[PDB]
Amino acid sequence: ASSFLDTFEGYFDQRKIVRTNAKSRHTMSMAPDVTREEFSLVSNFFNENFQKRPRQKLFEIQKKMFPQYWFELTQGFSLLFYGVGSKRNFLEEFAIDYLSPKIAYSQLVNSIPCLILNGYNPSCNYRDVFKEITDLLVPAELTRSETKYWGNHVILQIQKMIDFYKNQPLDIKLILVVHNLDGPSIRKNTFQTMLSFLSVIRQIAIVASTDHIYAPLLWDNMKAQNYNFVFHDISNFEPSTVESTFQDVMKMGKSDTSSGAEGAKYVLQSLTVNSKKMYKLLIETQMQNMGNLSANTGPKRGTQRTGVELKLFNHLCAADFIASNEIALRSMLREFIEHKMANITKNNSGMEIIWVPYTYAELEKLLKTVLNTL
Amino acid sequence: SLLVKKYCKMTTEEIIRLCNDFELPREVAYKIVDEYNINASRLVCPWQLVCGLVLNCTFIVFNERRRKDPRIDHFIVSKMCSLMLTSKVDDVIECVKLVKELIIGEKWFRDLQIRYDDFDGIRYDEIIFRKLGSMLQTTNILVTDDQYNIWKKRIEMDLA
Amino acid sequence: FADAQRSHYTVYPSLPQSNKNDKHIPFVKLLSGKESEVNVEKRWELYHQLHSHFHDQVDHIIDNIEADLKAEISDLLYSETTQKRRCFNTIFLLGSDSTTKIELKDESSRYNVLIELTPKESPNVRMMLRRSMYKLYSAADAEEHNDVSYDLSLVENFKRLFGKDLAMVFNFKDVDSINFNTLDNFIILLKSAFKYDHVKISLIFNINTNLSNIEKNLRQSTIRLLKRNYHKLDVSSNKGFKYGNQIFQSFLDTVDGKLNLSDRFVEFILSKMANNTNHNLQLLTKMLDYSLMSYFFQNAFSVFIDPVNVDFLNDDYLKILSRCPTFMFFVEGLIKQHAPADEILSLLTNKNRGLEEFFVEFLVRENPINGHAKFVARFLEEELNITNFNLIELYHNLLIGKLDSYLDRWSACKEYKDRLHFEPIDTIFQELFTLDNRSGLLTQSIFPSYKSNIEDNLLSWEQVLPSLDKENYDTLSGDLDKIMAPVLGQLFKLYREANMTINIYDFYIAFRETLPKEEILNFIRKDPSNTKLLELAETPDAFDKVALILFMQAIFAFENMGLIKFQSTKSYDLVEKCVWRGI
Amino acid sequence: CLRKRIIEEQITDCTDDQFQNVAANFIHLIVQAFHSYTGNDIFALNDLIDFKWPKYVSRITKENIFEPLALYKSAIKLFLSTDDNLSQTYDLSIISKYLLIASYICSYLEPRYDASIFSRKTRIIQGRAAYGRRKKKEVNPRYLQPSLFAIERLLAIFQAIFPIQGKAESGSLSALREESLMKANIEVFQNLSELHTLKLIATTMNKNIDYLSPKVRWKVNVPWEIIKEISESVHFNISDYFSDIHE
Amino acid sequence: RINTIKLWLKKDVKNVWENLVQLDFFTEKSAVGLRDNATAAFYASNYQFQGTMIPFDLRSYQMQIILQELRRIIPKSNMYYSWTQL
């Protein structure tokens, strides 16, 4: 077709005008209609059998790189892994099996806590991650002169934490492991600002990974200073079958990538029937409140106004015999809260509202495909 | 020179003749002929693809001889300018890079690099630690063990 | 509820009982397992005393770049006694990073409050004032040892409520990131505090880029207010090179007499430090550390820079140092000058004593370029009053021999170019104690061609996955592995040879013709255990369905890498390519 | 300033009625020069007096107090230019400096004509180059607001105009490995992101835009007078790219 | 066609340009000046408009007084009166 294939020469030469007769418009409906269960059947056979023996031998080669990375984490370098393929099974085998026992032995008993962080999850929140880090470090919380008139308490406590840890002994006491640092909810500027200032602290060791090809566009001179990555290419052509769970693969990637409701569809498939009857009751009651309050077909994502309050919800699931009391209700709610499939917050009157963060069209699709089959 | 000559047809007996003196084997010479027969209708200069395929294959088939002997990398481009009838070497290097773009993804050029173990100039065992970024990779600052092999043989016969 | 589907879970991993060893350092045994353990731990602690001696001085340097900058801004913030007394003294800090603290005077019978405003703290003009009036009322009760409305009426009631007059200082942090409608309206708001007879305002602008960009943004009547007294203070780590010359000289003091710097390394330092002009000194330190980390990790001869370990010398050390290219040039020089064979044979390995006695001679030379560069930099400083010079490219041109061809640009060293002349000499065995990048490790680890390493692994992929020959005829798919590419690598060359907008269905068929039809269906049948998978294989439609399943997880993997746009939502039939190789 | 000079110049032949008339005639002269610039302001005239009264006093001597026409010709260079303003304009990197130039090209040249201007390489395979613009447009698009471009067009025009790195050292062993044209390493994206935080490259305004998305387009916001100062620093002639479109 | 008239420079007309803005001869292009109530004026103060962030000479403005009205007010004895008609 084109004479040039790669340079700016190939960019300028392949972006030509195609004529209307020269366009061969074939709809993708002219294809074998593939069921979802045989999609998973053929994919799990090729991902577990096609090139294991090259990928296993490649993983034995780059396992000899592990003391060379550990020498870099003891010198204050954050450590970014790029390449083509899934880097997830590499990253949590290096950081849990190799890295964490060998820092602890070199500081002489228990291992270093290894907070790993799934950034391919589109529901990854930076305030919940920082809630986890202050449980592990237990920093001195922020005095009144330090909270500077609606200052950001997450950023202003890291800056107190840097000045504290500039005088502590140089010992790794946390390893935060960021899978897909350029993932959908973690590529935002408030998340990167958190993790850059948190990377200045030499007492915690950053081990991160990126999949997108324009990932270095995400760090300017100030963020690349605080990070000071050393970059490592680990191409291994792994399938990424866990990253292809929060995002529908039957639609080839036009599932909007930031919903999180497609990843919720995977969570419902292996639950209790009494935990699916509750969540079905929660969806159907909020679906009543979205069609009432909005008066609008178009996609608005469900928030606190459309949510059920908690004491009214306990009456709904006691008549349908899901929950016997308030505590057994709250014990099977929190498994949805930790996966952020349901949120609990209070309004301006004290009503404790429970609500599902998905749009109306994603809420009726989810109600029919997994929940209403019983 | 033949590099400036345009829209001239190349018989199979000539594109073999260009690589018969380089002593490229059967399977290297036939896939040069097959690659020419695809693009033969769409080339501006046919001799630029013919010299570019043969040079890219002679750096791969004879890479094992080229590591020990740095003389031959100057030999082949000096031999190439006289047979394409060009004056200086800059057009010959220019036609290597242009044909390297066209056959970098092809299946036979991959199997040519796996068999002769070249991987644009390296081994596999030496290029995978160069791509991983190992600090234990080889640095070309010392002479190699096989180049010190033939230096040690030569000097002892220059001793006595 | 798997942990793989959660976000941010915490592993408390299990550590084994005891691995029988005090081997818990990241250095490995070199010489392919011929190096002793006592050499590995010596090379570890000889690294840390050469690493810490470098960072004890760099931390001393960085503490001087702030103590100088606190004092240079404080000479200029105070004592400009204007006789008109109805304006503010403005301090433009050209190119300043906003990470400098400003200490104000104590200076009793006067309040000196410092009010710092970031562009995140400035969404609009009333939020600039309510934070500024909170920061002075909170910092005046801190020095005092009822509530006030936070507005500019606190400035007029300041003597009537605290008894001392005011001197407030504004420190705008990222003024290139603030919008200039708000900052213009806030300076005009502070202009209304010049009727109160007991206050003086002082603005400090941390302009990271330029003054010419700022005066095109502010309105013209504000610049006429800012010009009654302003002071431009150039604040940079890169001005006059005077702090980059101190960190690089601090590096050369640590490796004085024990490590050399190749000019291929020094001009790499010199080129990469010019590509980042705002943060040079952290990036100068990062490259000198990672090359120093690289040396002690890779050279078994790293233990031979203190003389107490020369009495250890072994046989595998003797087989590896003799391939140094200067050492062959020395034996070549003894061939060409002295005819007999025995003195050269006493140098070589057939004399077991002589070669290891030959290496103890050449370790103690000073190798005097490290002191001579410090000699030139001090002499060219105080004699000629020259400030604007790199010591880095002075050290680079000194390694080559182009010293006087570098000094002629100042045109005042013509009476001194003969006494400062120095031709370097190649010492023997200097390749074993040196810092160089001829392998390409620093421009792969610190400055990688990121996207070009992605498309090369996609397109080529033979440099990545091992092509193995014995083990494949045993396994389930090794008849398929020699004839079929990995699907991300197969789809990328169909991606690469295509135009900008491509139909998915035509891109599916063009993918499907590349695959072997008989051996995919032979591979899908070679597992006898899955009955559900063998039922798909009996269908006549088996290859057309396996090819689509295998296509559309790679067309999915190319989207979240960013290689493919789905043009024109509501249509979902054709895609646009984002990424070209080579760019 | 008027007080000090008259005793220190040793011309002590003056009264208050000359003191008042020398300052009054300056005000009538500072208005009659700069009324067309300020208008009917009071506060702009009050700034141009006190910015130009210390410079008007220091040019008086014995022949200048008594005759007003002689003093105006001895102070002519401060009644012609207002000067209400306070090496290179930016201290940007050498590849940040060519990445605003390529941003200014992508945002005012059209994408349709780029293959005719920047292409230089010989064709192994038959094909026709782009013909270029057939006729000039009389809008001069640099007057107009800059248009949006994609991130890959910027990186294509960046290496089209970036100077030759790794120059050929006349070696056949060295000429293959060189890759004389510059690829986008970690510094090109780090300097493009730094150029965005400095508000020199703009985007479409959405709260928490993602850099890493197909939909986000980019545009430059520097004027022509800044990118002209930038282009003369790196000896790049950006005016020839815009001379052929209308000027 | 014609003593001479001074042509003021690009840096000097900037002050003249900003006075015609603040005298309501030029308005910002699609501008909402004062809001109806207090909450709409508060919502607008937290939004950061585009014309603020684009450079000075690139802001699109519009026109309070059109040229056909501008010919009728300016007297016939001005030297600029011939340029109040295309």
UniProtKB/Swiss-Prot annotation, chain B:
- Which compartments does it reside in? Nucleus
Q: List the disulfide bonds.
A: none
- Identify the domain of life: Eukaryota
**What more is known?**
Present with 2970 molecules/cell in log phase SD medium.
Primary role: Component of the origin recognition complex (ORC) that binds origins of replication. It has a role in both chromosomal replication and mating type transcriptional silencing. Binds to the ARS consensus sequence (ACS) of origins of replication.
Tell me which family the UniProt entry assigns to this protein. Belongs to the ORC6 family.
Query: How does this protein assemble?
Result: Component of the origin recognition complex (ORC) composed of at least ORC1, ORC2, ORC3, ORC4, ORC5 and ORC6. Interacts with ORC3, ORC5 and TAH11.
Which protein is depicted?
Origin recognition complex subunit 6
Which species is the source of this protein?
Saccharomyces cerevisiae (strain ATCC 204508 / S288c)
Residues represented out of the complete protein: 271 to 430 of 435
UniProtKB/Swiss-Prot annotation, chain C:
Question: Taxonomically, which superkingdom?
Answer: Eukaryota
Gene Ontology BP terms: DNA replication initiation; pre-replicative complex assembly involved in nuclear cell cycle DNA replication; silent mating-type cassette heterochromatin formation
Show the GO cellular component annotation of the record. Answer: DNA replication preinitiation complex; nuclear origin of replication recognition complex; nuclear pre-replicative complex; nucleoplasm; nucleus
Keywords in alphabetical order, please.
Answer: Acetylation, DNA replication, DNA-binding, Nucleus
* InterPro entries hit by this protein: EF_Hand_1_Ca_BS, ORC3, ORC3_N, ORC_WH_C
Question: Which GO-annotated molecular functions does the record name?
Answer: chromatin binding; DNA replication origin binding
Main localization (coarse): nucleus
Cellular localization per UniProt? Nucleus
Q: List the disulfide bonds.
A: none
> PANTHER family under this entry?
ORIGIN RECOGNITION COMPLEX SUBUNIT 3
**Partners and quaternary state?**
Component of the origin recognition complex (ORC) composed of at least ORC1, ORC2, ORC3, ORC4, ORC5 and ORC6. Interacts with ORC6.
Function according to Swiss-Prot or TrEMBL: Component of the origin recognition complex (ORC) that binds origins of replication. It has a role in both chromosomal replication and mating type transcriptional silencing. Binds to the ARS consensus sequence (ACS) of origins of replication.
**What's this protein's family per the entry?**
Belongs to the ORC3 family.
Q: What is this protein called?
A: Origin recognition complex subunit 3
Can you name the source organism? Saccharomyces cerevisiae (strain ATCC 204508 / S288c)
Gene symbol here is ORC3
Swiss-Prot record, chain D:
Which key words tag this protein in UniProt?
ATP-binding, DNA replication, Nucleotide-binding, Nucleus
User: Superkingdom, according to UniProt?
Assistant: Eukaryota
One GO cellular component term: DNA replication preinitiation complex
Instruction: Please name the GO terms of the biological process aspect recorded for this protein, alphabetically.
Output: DNA replication initiation; pre-replicative complex assembly involved in nuclear cell cycle DNA replication; regulation of DNA replication; silent mating-type cassette heterochromatin formation
Principal localisation: nucleus
Show the GO MF annotations: ATP binding; DNA replication origin binding
Q: Where in the cell is it found?
A: Nucleus
Q: What does this protein do?
A: Component of the origin recognition complex (ORC) that binds origins of replication. It has a role in both chromosomal replication and mating type transcriptional silencing. Binds to the ARS consensus sequence (ACS) of origins of replication. This subunit is a candidate for the mediation of ATP-dependent binding of ORC to origins. May also be a substrate targeting component of a cullin-RING-based E3 ubiquitin-protein ligase complex RTT101(MMS1-ORC5).
- Subunit-level organization: Component of the origin recognition complex (ORC) composed of at least ORC1, ORC2, ORC3, ORC4, ORC5 and ORC6. Interacts with ORC6. Component of a cullin-RING ligase (CRL)-like complex composed of at least the cullin RTT101, a linker protein MMS1, and the potential substrate receptor ORC5. Interacts with RTT101 and MMS1.
Q: Which family does it belong to?
A: Belongs to the ORC5 family.
Q: What else is known?
A: Present with 768 molecules/cell in log phase SD medium.
Q: What is this protein called?
A: Origin recognition complex subunit 5
Swiss-Prot record, chain E:
* Role this protein plays: Component of the origin recognition complex (ORC) that binds origins of replication. It has a role in both chromosomal replication and mating type transcriptional silencing. Binds to the ARS consensus sequence (ACS) of origins of replication.
Name the coiled-coil region(s). Answer: none
Protein family membership: Belongs to the ORC4 family.
Subcellular localization, as worded in the UniProt entry: Nucleus
What name goes with this protein? Answer: Origin recognition complex subunit 4
The species is Saccharomyces cerevisiae (strain ATCC 204508 / S288c)
Tell me more from the record. Present with 2170 molecules/cell in log phase SD medium.
Subunit (UniProt): Component of the origin recognition complex (ORC) composed of at least ORC1, ORC2, ORC3, ORC4, ORC5 and ORC6.
Q: Which residues of the full protein are shown?
A: 425 to 529 of 529
